[PDB]
């Protein structure tokens, strides 16, 4: 199906003396496989998945020299954004960088990402056309035209459209048992009556992968339904439930519609 | 695969 490889970075500055924390994590279709933390004694690129584990000594050395080079870049990015916003060194700020690849069922390139963020707000982001940038505030306009003159997106395009998809396809094959799977939501329903006049129907969806599901409450085929964010169970599958408070006796009116990639037929659940 | 090139802000 549609897979993806993303790289998430987090660099939080430490006020004064002390090395700021650098975080690097890699996800292959929402599955972590590598990690790096500047506050760990290993000082290397650590694997968090079996597929990437047996990649040889040359792989880890090259990746560690690059995560250390991405760190040296984020050290300068902290102080640079300090001057852009005219901030003092006594503060602590968070820089978030993410670039990745998206790929469909055809296993061809479709979208590429490369975006930054400073103190939780957007900064600069790579558009869908991969040749123009987006500046959030005024300080971001300084780096928008600094990267337009240096053609950074064409040099990034050679990665998003080139090397990154090749290694994404490689990572999918090495972990086929835990990557391309489409598990189906083991849906069920529960009935909790808060009083003798009303009751809370609840539509569950358990043990499904990927996280793409849709839970909608409809009465006789026809929005005040309590929906919670798709949460992980930990075993590699996700969960999600949608509940609506209904008057007692009208439970036959309401139906739940579960749609998922693994489900060939869109399910409709009834009490 | 981390991208071999690093770009400064």
């Amino acid at each position, epitope marked *: 199906g549609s897979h993806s490889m993303r790289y998430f970075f987090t660099s939080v500055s430490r006020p004064g003396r002390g090395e700021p924390r650098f975080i690097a994590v890699g996800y292959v279709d929402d599955t972590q496989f590598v990690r790096f933390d500047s506050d760990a004694a290993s000082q290397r690129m650590e694997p968090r998945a079996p597929w990437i584990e047996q990649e040889g000594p040359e792989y880890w050395d090259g990746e560690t*020299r690059k995560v250390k080079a991405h760190s040296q870049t984020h050290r*300068v990015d902290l102080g640079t954004l300090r001057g852009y916003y005219n901030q003092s060194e006594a503060g602590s700020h968070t820089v978030q960088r993410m670039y990745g690849c998206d790929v469909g069922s055809d296993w061809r390139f479709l979208r590429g990402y490369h975006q930054y963020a400073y103190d939780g707000k957007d900064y600069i982001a790579l558009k869908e056309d991969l040749r123009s940038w987006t500046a959030a505030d005024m300080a971001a306009q300084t780096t928008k035209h600094k990267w337009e003159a240096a053609h950074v997106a064409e040099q990034l*395009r*050679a990665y998003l459209e*080139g*090397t990154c998809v*090749e290694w994404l396809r490689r990572y999918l094959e090495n972990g086929k048992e835990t990557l391309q799977r489409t598990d189906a939501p083991k849906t069920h329903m529960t009935h909790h009556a808060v009083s003798d006049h009303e009751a809370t129907l609840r539509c569950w969806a358990l043990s499904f992968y990927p996280a793409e599901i849709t839970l909608t409450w409809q009465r006789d085929g026809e929005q005040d339904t309590e929906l919670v964010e798709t949460r992980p169970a930990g075993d590699g599958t996700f969960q999600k439930w949608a509940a609506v408070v209904v008057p007692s006796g009208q439970e036959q009116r309401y139906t739940c519609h579960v749609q998922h990639e693994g489900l060939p037929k869109p399910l409709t659940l009834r009490w | 695969y981390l991208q071999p*090139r690093t770009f*400064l802000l």
Partner: T-cell receptor
Amino acid sequence: RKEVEQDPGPFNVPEGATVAFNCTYSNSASQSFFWYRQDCRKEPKLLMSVYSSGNEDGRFTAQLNRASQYISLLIRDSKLSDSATYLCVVNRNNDMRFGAGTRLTVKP
Amino acid sequence: GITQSPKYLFRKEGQNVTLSCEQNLNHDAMYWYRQDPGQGLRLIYYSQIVNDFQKGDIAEGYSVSREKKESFPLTVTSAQKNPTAFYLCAGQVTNTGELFFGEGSRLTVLE
């Protein structure tokens, strides 16, 4: 082969002629490419940057083919000012790796 | 507009020598290449950020130190593989990748 391999040369062409350079890089993940000019006993000077689009800079035209991993420099109406060795520069990580170079000597 | 010193250099065999390389254009990184006839440019040392420095393809027998952003001295030690040789210093703009070299320093050994 090597990480950056070009033509052995040298190239001895008459004035005004067109000279074509070639370069093959082994690292498929490379993304920054440049053509550098270096005179005899001098330092290399950046001639132009290379992009997959194929940028034309007056008499100099550089083209890139990431598929075949090959870079070509084209110089038309070569003058005596062009007599130098032209180095093919490809990136490793952020460090640039230089090829052995090909020499162009223009005869008037 | 990076400046390397001295442009021409000579040192006896067994005597160490340091060639300086400062930059006034506020570059991002600094590199140390070398040129010998018959082969291309081979990387020696390079520093992406201040107080850091990484080895190159022929770093054995050389030593650098990036204690300041506007200096990156290379010390040609008693590594005997240095007869007449072109030692070059470069400065990179990480956004563009362009390498800006100094006028170069020619080191020759005399017995």
